[PDB]
Design an enzyme around this catalytic site. Sequence first.
Site, PDB file in Angstrom:
ATOM      1  N   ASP A 178      -0.893   0.962  10.344  1.00  0.00           N
ATOM      2  CA  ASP A 178      -1.220   2.298  10.830  1.00  0.00           C
ATOM      3  C   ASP A 178      -2.742   2.491  10.885  1.00  0.00           C
ATOM      4  O   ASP A 178      -3.507   1.781  10.230  1.00  0.00           O
ATOM      5  CB  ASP A 178      -0.623   3.354   9.905  1.00  0.00           C
TER       6      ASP A 178
ATOM      7  N   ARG B  66      -9.420  -4.244  13.709  1.00  0.00           N
ATOM      8  CA  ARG B  66      -9.671  -3.366  12.571  1.00  0.00           C
ATOM      9  C   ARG B  66      -8.401  -2.724  12.030  1.00  0.00           C
ATOM     10  O   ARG B  66      -8.439  -2.192  10.921  1.00  0.00           O
ATOM     11  CB  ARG B  66     -10.672  -2.268  12.937  1.00  0.00           C
ATOM     12  N   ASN B  67      -7.289  -2.747  12.771  1.00  0.00           N
ATOM     13  CA  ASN B  67      -6.007  -2.254  12.265  1.00  0.00           C
ATOM     14  C   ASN B  67      -5.021  -3.394  12.001  1.00  0.00           C
ATOM     15  O   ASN B  67      -3.803  -3.223  12.090  1.00  0.00           O
ATOM     16  CB  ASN B  67      -5.422  -1.197  13.207  1.00  0.00           C
TER      17      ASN B  67
ATOM     18  N   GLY C 216     -15.775   5.162   3.472  1.00  0.00           N
ATOM     19  CA  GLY C 216     -16.469   5.837   4.547  1.00  0.00           C
ATOM     20  C   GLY C 216     -17.031   7.165   4.075  1.00  0.00           C
ATOM     21  O   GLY C 216     -17.324   7.354   2.887  1.00  0.00           O
ATOM     22  N   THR C 217     -17.177   8.099   5.026  1.00  0.00           N
ATOM     23  CA  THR C 217     -17.685   9.423   4.671  1.00  0.00           C
ATOM     24  C   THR C 217     -16.706  10.162   3.766  1.00  0.00           C
ATOM     25  O   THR C 217     -17.107  10.740   2.746  1.00  0.00           O
ATOM     26  CB  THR C 217     -17.982  10.260   5.918  1.00  0.00           C
TER      27      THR C 217
ATOM     28  N   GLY D 123     -13.047   8.828   3.414  1.00  0.00           N
ATOM     29  CA  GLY D 123     -11.904   8.024   3.036  1.00  0.00           C
ATOM     30  C   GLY D 123     -12.257   6.791   2.230  1.00  0.00           C
ATOM     31  O   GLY D 123     -13.411   6.347   2.201  1.00  0.00           O
ATOM     32  N   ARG D 124     -11.256   6.209   1.582  1.00  0.00           N
ATOM     33  CA  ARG D 124     -11.529   5.162   0.611  1.00  0.00           C
ATOM     34  C   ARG D 124     -10.271   4.335   0.409  1.00  0.00           C
ATOM     35  O   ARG D 124      -9.200   4.889   0.162  1.00  0.00           O
ATOM     36  CB  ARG D 124     -11.996   5.804  -0.682  1.00  0.00           C
ATOM     37  N   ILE D 125     -10.384   3.021   0.544  1.00  0.00           N
ATOM     38  CA  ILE D 125      -9.238   2.140   0.348  1.00  0.00           C
ATOM     39  C   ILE D 125      -9.444   1.380  -0.950  1.00  0.00           C
ATOM     40  O   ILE D 125     -10.465   0.703  -1.125  1.00  0.00           O
ATOM     41  CB  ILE D 125      -9.043   1.182   1.527  1.00  0.00           C
TER      42      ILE D 125
END
Length: 294
Positions: free
Chosen positions: A173, A159-160, A35-36, A38-40
């Site tokens: 979470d 989405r979670n 995202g702007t 964050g990163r997984i």
Amino acid sequence: YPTLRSVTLLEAKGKVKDIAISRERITLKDVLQEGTFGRIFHGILIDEKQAFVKTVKDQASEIQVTMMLTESCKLRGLHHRNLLPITHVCIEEGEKPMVILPYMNWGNLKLFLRQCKLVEANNPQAISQQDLVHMAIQIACGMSYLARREVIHKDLAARNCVIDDTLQVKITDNALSRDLFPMDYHCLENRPVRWMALESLVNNEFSSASDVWAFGVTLWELMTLGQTPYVDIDPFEMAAYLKDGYRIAQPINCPDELFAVMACCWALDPEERPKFQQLVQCLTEFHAALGAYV
């Protein structure tokens, strides 16, 4: 005489200090979501086990990094096969913090549903309602474990959740969820308005019964293969539309009786909605029924 009535980065690092390990035991591989700020990652943890790794970009502020850590703890200390709690952190001074979780190799449930939805385009009678309910049961079974322990999730949505190649689902979470799924949170504070019970919208009240409301919407996500709900409705008018007794439309090819279950979750009176345990019982019954009656 009383008074009418803010976590810091160090305080947030403090709450995870007991599962902190050294970065050097972590090998990041592919970026799965970004995202702007964050990163997984998909990464590797040496004793090797496979992991999700949540982390931030250099653009991330101290406020965002802090809320990543604090939101990562929502499920700490809970142990249930349909819950994905965090297992380790890396919080060394001067470096970007990482949250580490067990890997589920088919990734984000919502993004997975939509990939299936692309399959259904050219193979219309391909999706298995039994398979979908199997996912619903697991979600309800984890929520039941949370609700019995007075843990309120407050952001139950597809989405979670995450899914693996055995079709096992786990609730996660919500850390980074607002940065990774920005289109699902609205200021009307940045809230999942389209998943929220009317009393959460109006009075800011949350409970297992409003968790159950969001389960109803999450069940609708499943039966539509991940459709964004209430696309035709302006988030500022979400409460008014709910008060006037309107609800989302029944998914195509979804049995009347299963839509009645998800309508039950959207009763305005919180004490008329079912409990997750009754939901587990009922959807279990539905699972056999959807196998025999196609």
